[PDB]
Amino acid sequence: PYYAFAEPFFIHAITHLHVGSGSSVEEEIDLPFQRDELGYPTIYASSLKGAIKSFLLKEFPDKRDVIYKVLGEDENPEEASLGTFLDAILFAIPS
Amino acid sequence: LVNAGSGSIVDYVKTVLKCIRENLNKCSCAEKIYSNEVAKVMFRVNVEKANVEEEVKNSLEYFETILNEGRIIVTPAWHVSISSALNRGLLVELELVNKHKGFVIYAGGDDLLAMLPVDEVLDFIKESRRAFAGFGTEKLGNMCLENGFVRINNAYYPSLPIVGRSYSVIIAHYADPLFFVINDSYNLLEEGKEIIRYRVMYNGEYKDAKKDVAIFRYQGLTSVIPLSLKRPIVSSVSDFNEIASIIDVILELKKRIDEGRISVSLLYDYEKYKHLIVASDEKYLTEFLVKDWIKRNSLRKHVEFTIDEKLYGVRLTIENYPIKIPNDLISNIVYTLRIIYGGEK
């Protein structure tokens, strides 16, 4: 297999969520939400990875080397990370 | 003339060159210099027939011809000294070609022909250029290099610090015909070194020198790295430590690349930073553009590589020749690395 483990999951907003896409000329909301390629909200995998990686680095302070291999070093990255995140697709929204 | 001949004599000749400058006294200078000599000849009662009015004239006649001809009057001792020094500089030049694992093809006097590996070529030019000027680090054979004075066991001998020395490096495939590699080396320099001008710092002004250039060539790519940047190449003992000062700038840069401290993309991104570093005439601003260009395509976060900052604006030109040289020094430093790295793959 190309991937050792493949772990899909769901991301449940416990509170209101705001992953920023930064201000832009054509938005009309000053701080908008990260959008999809067809309009819906989404979480860029760069936001997921960086948020989860920063979480793990302080929750598991002894598994640094195990996290750094799978999620990439930070000081001197002599190689590529082994784990990938996929952009979070909006599954269902409360209406 | 004034610096030569030091002692009580200097203030005498200091006044003889004074009474010349704008078509001066015409032997009516004795008055200023007779006092110098006649108030000196009584320091010992042995003057036989020293006609002081003629003695100071003949001296005034001597320096006149020197300044009229604009050249030192050549004597045998002037030749024998330059000739012998040229043979001692040959000795130290052979140790350097052996130290850098090279093969001397001929080295007679000022000339030299060697085959170095592409690796030891840059630091060879660095040491060879300075060793020619007498300045140098650790002894090579039984002779040391003491700021323009080769020394063999307490015996100090003069070298040629002022004389420029151009270099010509052809990076050639081992299978290239040796007829056209040697021909190019004598038609890349001896008619390419004759046409290359750069902006030299002369007495506070910025003039255009043309010699001492160290040309590099790798099948079409050409680079020129001036070795002086100051037109009287040495005028004081502090002038030595910046001869070939651009070479170690390339040497340090090359060092930080193979250690992965700087990506080789450094050589490929300079093009966009170049137009700003060219147009910028405020040196506090350029020392930040090259600091930015270095750190952008750097592969680490603790590489602090400086450029001597006297290298901002050289503008090497060339008069209508089939050799295309970038018209700025930092660009030539990039091409020199591409040539050195092109001959290692």
Q: B140 CB contacts (<8 Å, ≥6 apart)?
A: B92, B95, B96, B99, B131
Distances (CA, A) of B230 to B166, B207, B319: 15, 10, 22
Considering only CB atoms, which residues of chain B are within 8 Å of chain A? 300-301
Q: Which of A35, A31, A33 is nearest to A19 (CA)?
A: A33
**What is the DSSP secondary-structure string of B43-111?**
TSTT-SS--HHHHHHHHHHHHHHHHHHTSPPP-HHHHHHHHHHHHHHHHHHHHHHHHTT-EEEE--TT-
Q: Cα distance from B262 to chain A (closest Cα, Å)? A: 13
B190 is in an annotated binding site: yes
Q: Which residues of B touch A73 (CB under 8 A)?
A: none
**What is the DSSP secondary-structure string of B271-319?**
HHHHHHHHH---HHHHHHHHHHHHHHTBSSS-------SS-S----EES
HSE-up of residue B91 (Cα within 13 Å, Cβ side) = 17
A 37-76 residues with CB < 8 A to B: 75-76
Q: Which residues of B touch A76 (CB under 8 A)?
A: 300-301
Q: Which residues of A touch B259 (CB under 8 A)?
A: none
Instruction: Pull the structure tokens for residue B138.
Output: 């650790």
Q: Which residues of A touch B300 (CB under 8 A)?
A: 76
Picking from A76, A78, A79 by the largest number of B CB atoms within 10 A of its own CB, the best residue to mutate is: A76
Distances (CA, A) of A66 to A57, A85, A86: 10, 16, 20
Distance CA A89, CA A11 (A): 10
Distance CA B205, CA B201 (A): 6
Q: Cα distance from A73 to chain B (closest Cα, Å)? A: 13
**Experimental technique used to determine this entry:** cryo-EM
Strands of the sheet with B317-318, listed across from one edge: B205-209, B196-202, B317-318
Q: Which of A59, A86, A53, A83 is nearest to A69 (CA)?
A: A83
Q: If DSSP codes are grouped into helix, strand and coil, which group holds residue B233? A: coil
B38, containing H or E segment: helix B30-41
Which residue from A minimizes the CA distance to B260? A78
Instruction: Pull the structure tokens for residue A27.
Output: 């938005």
Beta strands B196-202 and B205-209 are: antiparallel
Q: How many residues does chain B have?
A: 345
Size of interface A-B (CB pairs under 8 A): 3
Q: Cα distance from A74 to chain B (closest Cα, Å)? A: 11
Q: Cα distance from A95 to chain B (closest Cα, Å)? A: 47
Q: Cα distance from A35 to chain B (closest Cα, Å)? A: 30
Q: B7 CB contacts (<8 Å, ≥6 apart)?
A: none
Distance CA A60, CA B156 (A): 70
Which residue from A minimizes the CA distance to B261? A76
Question: Are B240 and B133 contacting, i.e. CB atoms less than 8 angstroms apart?
Answer: yes
Which residue from B minimizes the CA distance to A78? B299
Q: B134 CB contacts (<8 Å, ≥6 apart)?
A: B145, B146, B147, B148, B149, B150, B158, B159, B160, B161, B240
- A79 touching B, CB under 8 A? no
**B337 phi, psi to nearest 5 deg:** -70, -40
